[PDB]
Design an enzyme around this catalytic site. Structure first.
Site, mmCIF file in Angstrom:
data_model
loop_
_atom_site.group_PDB
_atom_site.id
_atom_site.type_symbol
_atom_site.label_atom_id
_atom_site.label_comp_id
_atom_site.label_asym_id
_atom_site.label_seq_id
_atom_site.Cartn_x
_atom_site.Cartn_y
_atom_site.Cartn_z
ATOM 1 N N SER A 56 0.812 -1.389 -0.015
ATOM 2 C CA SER A 56 -0.069 0.267 -0.076
ATOM 3 C C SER A 56 0.905 1.276 -0.027
ATOM 4 C CB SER A 56 -0.911 0.130 1.160
ATOM 5 O OG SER A 56 -1.966 -0.831 1.173
ATOM 6 N N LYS A 59 0.727 3.357 -2.968
ATOM 7 C CA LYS A 59 -0.456 4.483 -3.155
ATOM 8 C C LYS A 59 0.372 5.930 -2.833
ATOM 9 C CE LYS A 59 -3.474 1.003 -1.324
ATOM 10 N NZ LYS A 59 -4.553 0.224 -0.387
ATOM 11 N N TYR A 140 -11.307 2.084 3.916
ATOM 12 C CA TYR A 140 -9.924 1.849 3.265
ATOM 13 C C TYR A 140 -10.262 0.584 2.284
ATOM 14 C CZ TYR A 140 -4.848 0.942 3.065
ATOM 15 O OH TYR A 140 -3.653 0.839 2.503
ATOM 16 N N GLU A 263 -1.477 9.495 6.395
ATOM 17 C CA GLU A 263 -2.480 9.556 7.461
ATOM 18 C C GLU A 263 -1.573 10.255 8.452
ATOM 19 O OE1 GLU A 263 -4.092 5.815 8.395
ATOM 20 O OE2 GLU A 263 -4.564 5.234 6.404
ATOM 21 N N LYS A 304 2.482 5.754 6.757
ATOM 22 C CA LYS A 304 1.994 4.861 6.043
ATOM 23 C C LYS A 304 2.527 3.335 6.144
ATOM 24 C CE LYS A 304 -1.310 3.586 3.276
ATOM 25 N NZ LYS A 304 -1.435 2.616 4.003
ATOM 26 N N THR A 305 1.699 2.358 6.419
ATOM 27 C CA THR A 305 2.010 0.935 6.332
ATOM 28 C C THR A 305 1.724 0.442 4.932
ATOM 29 O OG1 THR A 305 -0.150 0.318 6.973
ATOM 30 C CG2 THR A 305 1.202 0.608 8.696
ATOM 31 N N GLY A 306 2.529 -0.585 4.571
ATOM 32 C CA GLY A 306 2.509 -1.236 3.295
ATOM 33 C C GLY A 306 3.038 -2.575 3.444
ATOM 34 N N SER A 307 2.105 -3.642 2.749
ATOM 35 C CA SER A 307 2.399 -4.975 2.852
ATOM 36 C C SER A 307 2.083 -5.711 1.702
ATOM 37 C CB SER A 307 1.741 -5.738 4.038
ATOM 38 O OG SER A 307 1.776 -5.283 5.239
#
Length: 351
Positions: A56, A59, A140, A263, A304-307
């Site tokens: 993510s 994004k 989300y 965020e 921001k997290t992303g996986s």
């Protein structure tokens, strides 16, 4: 100079993270902490140039490109979706604005493209008869942010892959950031490791994958991006403005201010508020929002997290401290663990 190792020592062992890198930018000075292997089999180590799947965090590039497209007059972030997907005129989806897509302000969508949708044209048809269960709430979803990338690429006259690789990545000064990793760089592409089976893994194709979660990058390139997000990079006035457009406060949720994918929390924060804001109970269900033009405090932290299936990432910036941290791992490990370890590292840096 050993702060990142102490901050992440626990999570690396609690989740058997095969490889991990932490880039820090502070006052323009770049530093990296690297440990473990990008690939277990051939024992390739992680470096600042190892490519990870951003999930993510991709994004971020999406909304920057949309903001850059606005800076150039190709679209307006206030226009309705129906101005660009005209079969959606009159429908709730076609009356969402591009800003609504960038901020998940849609009233409720599934997180993933439905299994039954075979391509983006079929997804547009699906959206035509979609009805948000809770209009005005934040929800989300890959569907809405993915559609925005599809719209932006359409307005630029090229694939989203070519928009990323020939427009936004060069504009941002990146040299190891790809949707499609080329032959000479594939040796740097880390393997992911599945949580359940411990088996090597790589993102699989899917509808709107390029637009929503298809970026691969390195810790070094991400610091270039974070210098730009901190306002202290090299870019044209276009890009400096587009970056700032993506951090503007748009909606207020119970726990943070929603910008475009970014965020934003007050700085300083209770880390427990950072944890809950990135927890599943908040991520996977519609949340009420209040409209607003800015964050409550003028000093903020944006994260921001992303996986993907095999990767766990996290970026945070504190602009009043000219501080940026990127953490990339080839194991998907819990959001709460990424937040606490990164928050621990930040406190040590600023102590």
């Amino acid at each position: 100079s050993n702060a990142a190792a102490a901050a992440f020592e626990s999570v690396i062992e609690e989740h058997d993270i095969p490889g991990l890198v932490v880039g820090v930018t502070h006052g323009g000075r770049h530093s990296f902490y690297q440990t473990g292997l990008a690939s277990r089999e051939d024992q390739q180590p992680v470096t600042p140039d190892t490519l990870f799947e951003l999930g993510s965090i991709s994004k971020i590039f999406n909304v920057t490109l949309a903001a850059l497209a606005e800076e150039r007059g190709a679209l307006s972030l206030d226009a309705p979706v129906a101005d660009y997907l005209p079969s959606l005129r009159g429908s709730p989806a076609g009356e969402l604005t591009l800003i609504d897509l960038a901020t998940h302000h849609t009233g409720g969508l599934p997180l993933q493209v439905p299994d039954e949708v075979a391509d983006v044209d079929r997804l547009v048809d699906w959206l035509r008869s979609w009805r948000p269960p809770e209009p005005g709430t934040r929800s989300y979803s890959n569907i809405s942010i993915g559609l925005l990338g599809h719209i932006t690429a359409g307005v630029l006259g090229m694939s989203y892959a070519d928009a990323s690789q020939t427009v936004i990545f060069p504009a941002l000064g990146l040299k190891s950031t790809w949707i499609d990793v080329p032959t000479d760089a594939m040796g740097r592409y880390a393997f992911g490791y599945d949580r359940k089976t411990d088996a090597p893994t790589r993102v699989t194709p899917g509808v709107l994958d390029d637009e929503a979660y298809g970026v691969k990058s390195s810790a070094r390139d991400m610091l270039t991006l974070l210098d730009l997000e901190l306002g202290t990079g090299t870019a044209s006035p276009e890009v400096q403005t587009a970056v700032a457009t993506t951090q503007e406060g748009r909606f207020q949720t119970r726990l943070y201010t929603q910008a475009m994918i970014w965020e934003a929390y007050p700085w300083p924060v209770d880390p427990e508020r950072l944890v809950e804001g990135n927890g599943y109970d908040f991520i996977l269900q519609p949340q009420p929002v209040d409209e607003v033009d800015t964050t409550p405090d003028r000093r903020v932290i944006l994260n921001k997290t992303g996986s993907t299936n095999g990767f766990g990432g996290y970026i945070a910036i504190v602009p009043s401290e000219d501080l940026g941290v990127v953490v990339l791992a080839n194991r998907n490990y819990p959001n709460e663990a990424r937040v606490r370890a990164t928050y621990d590292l930040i406190t040590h840096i600023l102590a």
